[PDB]
Amino acid sequence: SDTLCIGYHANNSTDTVDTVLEKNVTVTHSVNLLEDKHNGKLCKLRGVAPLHLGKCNIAGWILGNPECESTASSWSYIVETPSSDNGTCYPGDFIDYEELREQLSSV
Amino acid sequence: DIQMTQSPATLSASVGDRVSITCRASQSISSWLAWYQQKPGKAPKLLIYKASSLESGVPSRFSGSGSGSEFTLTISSLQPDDFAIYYCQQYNSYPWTFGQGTKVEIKRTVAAPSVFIFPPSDEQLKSGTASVVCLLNNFYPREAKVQWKVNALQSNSQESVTEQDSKDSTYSLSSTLTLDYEKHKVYACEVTHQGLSSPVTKSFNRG
Amino acid sequence: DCNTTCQTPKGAINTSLPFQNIHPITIGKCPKYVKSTKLRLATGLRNIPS
Amino acid sequence: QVQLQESGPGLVKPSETLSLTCSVSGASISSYYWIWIRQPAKGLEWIGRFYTSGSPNYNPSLRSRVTMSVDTSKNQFSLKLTSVTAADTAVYYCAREEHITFGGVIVRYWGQGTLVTVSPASTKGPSVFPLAPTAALGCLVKDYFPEPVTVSWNSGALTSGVHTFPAVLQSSGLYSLSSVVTVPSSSLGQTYICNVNHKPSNTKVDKKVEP
Amino acid sequence: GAIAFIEGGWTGMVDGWYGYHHQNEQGSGYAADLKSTQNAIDEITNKVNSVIEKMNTQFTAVGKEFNHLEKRIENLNKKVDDGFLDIWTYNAELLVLLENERTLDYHDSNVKNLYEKVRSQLKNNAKEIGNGCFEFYHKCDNTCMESVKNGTYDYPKYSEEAKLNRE
Amino acid sequence: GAIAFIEGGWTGMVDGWYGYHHQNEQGSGYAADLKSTQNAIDEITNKVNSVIEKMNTQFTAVGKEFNHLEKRIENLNKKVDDGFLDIWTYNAELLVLLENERTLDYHDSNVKNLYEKVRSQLKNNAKEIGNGCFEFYHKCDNTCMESVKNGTYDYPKYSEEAKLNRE
Amino acid sequence: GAIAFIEGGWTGMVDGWYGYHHQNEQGSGYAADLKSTQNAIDEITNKVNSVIEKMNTQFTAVGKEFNHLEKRIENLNKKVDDGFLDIWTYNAELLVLLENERTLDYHDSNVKNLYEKVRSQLKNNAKEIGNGCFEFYHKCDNTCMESVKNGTYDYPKYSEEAKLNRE
Ligand SMILES: *[C@@H]1O[C@H](CO)[C@@H](O[C@@H]2O[C@H](CO)[C@@H](O)[C@H](O)[C@H]2NC(C)=O)[C@H](O)[C@H]1NC(C)=O
Ligand SMILES: *[C@@H]1O[C@H](CO)[C@@H](O)[C@H](O)[C@H]1NC(C)=O
């Protein structure tokens, strides 16, 4: 009559993990090591806010393109938009544009 | 069986300060400690379990640290809603034991109390008791002197204080004078508070 | 007006975990980019309600 | 989310048993461990734990006078505390002990809390008087036993600027309290009524405040 | 091989990863073994925290910009990004696959050792009915049932009473 | 430690990785255990396929060309190729060394559990002669020999016949 | 779980990692088991030497120099140095954490198997008093004590003398 068993926990968990010997093993408890979600914002990096140029690109901002008449003492990084077109309104060659870009990116 | 010793017991910090509450266990308990926040007239809610795991739903201004015998709850930047008593609790062993708690009030700027005076109800007079009520509405800090005059001082009054206002960190204070009453004509309320230059006196004439 | 320690062109991320699949171009003290869809490290045991 | 509510006498005379009951909505009562916790108006103290299937565990400082049970037919669980004293006056909570996680076992969901007073004193019914008048006005909930009394304004509608004070014990051995509200002195033309309810005397009573 | 001679797990056992189910005159219930559970959780978190906290990253801005005449360093940059991508992806996948094997083995290992510690004490007083369960020949009350759990069970003082039912 | 108390392996056992050899009146032969073999192979392929299939590579042209005035990026390129070479070489060597240890342990583990499952049932009816073999006290025919293999062997119904030869 | 039912280790046992302590009429002493120790050391060195010798490095000059107009390749170079730093740091930490687990398990494994080999032979002639020790019912001299160590112990030829004290 009198009995005693040894056993282990089970629950409602549907979480599957993979092992090297076996795939789709349902487990009671698991953690995720993979970050798959983002806030959808451009935040302040190290408390310091980025420099957002709007419709301008660096060329446009630095030279003073007339469309770019709308800057902080420091910034953590620079933000352009894919449509950012206002740069060099008079045609010509910007010597070492990419280097100036890398060199202005954080101040 | 396992004593939980918490410190400090009271604490006043301004909006934005960092706050640190410390808990100690009489024997090693590894990381089997939780932190609760109990608001007034409420069940204590879970903030942090397993010493340093932030409850789903809970703001990241809360954080937990430690294992073994010493533990710490930090609020990196304090907000007015953080007014409550905070409890640590171990679940290493049976029985579960909690700390003696830590009451955290918010230190805001001085606000003077607007005073109101309230005569007894005629309905109450018909029953053979008379109550006079002084109200100090929305002020900080809590400390205040309320004196009753009949223009003679009284020794028969009781005071009651609200808990801190969870939105703008205020208090409210009522002073009851229980009394006999129809014998005198002038009833005043002398209110002394640090927010005021000179004491405020709200009174009334019976009738 | 959020703070982050890792920035991506489509969003910021929490740096709790070692790996991320959001974007390869990141700025900051970022988690290492990978092409996985799940990385699930089992803490509990095999769930067999018979 | 899962609801737990406490019910019980409120006032129970010395040396007697105290019974409490915890209704659970939103989860099965067969499928969880359940605990009781109290605190005197002093710190929190863990009473014990019960499971349908099943081995209870009670706090030694009380273990001899306490008993717990589950009622599957009504999804309720109960606490019995024999031979009560002054020390036993507390606010009692029921809570659900979660399934073991990587946490492992924690109290996540609690009950609203019920107050319990250990006195030979008789249940006394409150009397409610108006406090006639930006202007302030209110009610005086005077001469009752024991706590508590709910005080709403215009059937819970008027929330903003309401201040209900903690009751004070008067020399007679009874409770008194005031509930006041701050409203515009422009807006007195508007009817103001305070709803006072003291359940262990059945004193449901409403009072209009006028100048 | 203890998880899946003990086919299944107990949804009835709510307060631990490992434990016991008993039955006697006084009654029956699941009872978790906290000490084995506490260790397992303490060691497994240390494991999870090692995979995570060990990743101490350098401040990087991964992005770079080149012109129409710098296509080669462009592709050098891309080779750097893609080589690291491949290394991390591979390693992260395997690290998971391998530690997952060990975790599950560990859990199996603990159960096994729990069942083995019990079998070691009881010897002849009970019958191994399979399915992880011991069926007592003698009457084992809660107290007796307790001693087994905390490993202080006294074999001789039941064997003569168990010898009667053995025949 | 079951592979190399059982010194050697059986070239006679042709149809599985694990199994049994028997002897009775009716005759003697090797008989493989398919179910343990099938699992071992199914789990080990999953292992081999994880090391291989997980390697999802990016399209790369490793080659680059620089002139006589670009020696520095040349050496930067070479540093990239050689750093990845070193990482992969090291990791690949170890991955092999470590999984090879575990595989061989696994195989040892399975045998051990097979021998332990047999020893668990037979109890006193047979003598452990070392060398992995059980020598029966009683007569065990093919049917009896079968029940052991699929783990349904009935201990009591031979012990009195085995008790005679035990003395 | 053999290291920390055997709570502690013997500072008295000076000439091996694994061994025995005995006591009889003739006297008592620690005696190391060389063969298990020799293997453990031979296998563990092979392990240590694999982590080390497998690192076959390419000749590199890590340093590079760029001018005020080459800030981008500068940062590309730095990305290469820092990406490799991160990979190596992480891998080296884990490689240690994981092989350390296995080493310690191995050591536990060997002890367990030593204690199990002894328990397997002695059967009923001795009492398992816990704490890893066997208490003999009969008189076991040095010669008898030796046979156990090298696994040739003869069970029957003491059991009748041990049966007397068993009752
Ligand atoms: C600023 O940018 C805008 C759009 O990015 C330019 O507007 C375009 O200019 C071209 C070239 O003359 C026109 O053909 C299009 O009709 C314009 N598009 C729009 C949407 O207006 C604008 O010329 C730029 N201005 C300066 C000063 O650089
Ligand atoms: C981060 O931004 C917050 C505003 O959300 C600001 O208060 C703070 O100064 C910044 N830096 C911190 C918290 O280190």
Author numbering:
A (entry chain A): 10 to 79, 82 to 118
B (entry chain L): 1 to 150, 152 to 156, 158 to 181, 185 to 212
C (entry chain A): 284 to 333
D (entry chain H): 1 to 41, 43 to 134, 143 to 198, 200 to 221
E (entry chain B), F (entry chain B), G (entry chain B): 4 to 7, 9 to 171
What does the paper say about this structure?
To elucidate the structural basis of the broad neutralizing activity of 3E1 against group 1 IAVs, we determined the crystal structures of 3E1 Fab in complex with the HA ectodomain of two H1N1 strains, namely A/California/04/2009 (CA09) and A/Washington/05/2011 (WA11), at 2.9 and 3.1 Å resolution, respectively. However, the trimeric HA of CA09 is unstable in solution and tends to dissociate into monomers; thus, we introduced two mutations (G205C and R220C) that form a disulfide bond at the monomer–monomer interface, leading to the formation of a stable HA trimer. A comparison of the structures of the two complexes did not reveal notable differences in the overall structure, indicating that the introduction of the disulfide bond in the CA09 HA trimer has no effect on the overall conformation of the HA trimer. In the 3E1 Fab–CA09 HA complex, 3E1 Fab specifically recognizes and binds to the conserved stem region of HA. Although the two proteins have a shape complementarity value of 0.59, which is slightly smaller than the average value (0.64–0.68) of the antigen–antibody complexes, the interacting interface buries a total solvent accessible surface area of 1597 Å2 (821 Å2 for Fab and 776 Å2 for HA), which is no less than the average value of the antigen–antibody complexes (1,200–1,700 Å2 for total, 600–900 Å2 for Fab, and 560–850 Å2 for antigen). The antigen-binding site or paratope of 3E1 is composed of large portions of the three HCDR loops and small portions of the three LCDR loops and HFR2. The HA epitope consists of several discontinuous segments, including the C-terminus of the fusion peptide (residues 16–21 of HA2), part of the F subdomain (residues 38–52 of HA2 and residues 18, 38 and 326 of HA1) and the C-terminus of the outermost β-strand preceding helix A (residue 34 of HA2).
Haemagglutinin (HA) of IAV is an envelope glycoprotein that is responsible for receptor attachment and membrane fusion, leading to virus invasion. We previously reported a VH4-4-encoded mAb isolated from a volunteer who had received the A(H1N1)09pdm vaccine; the mAb, named 3E1, can target the HA stem region. In this work, we demonstrate that 3E1 exhibited broad neutralizing activity against H1 and H5 subtype viruses in vitro and protected mice against H1N1 and H5N6 viruses in vivo by inhibiting the low pH-induced HA conformational rearrangement, hence blocking membrane fusion.
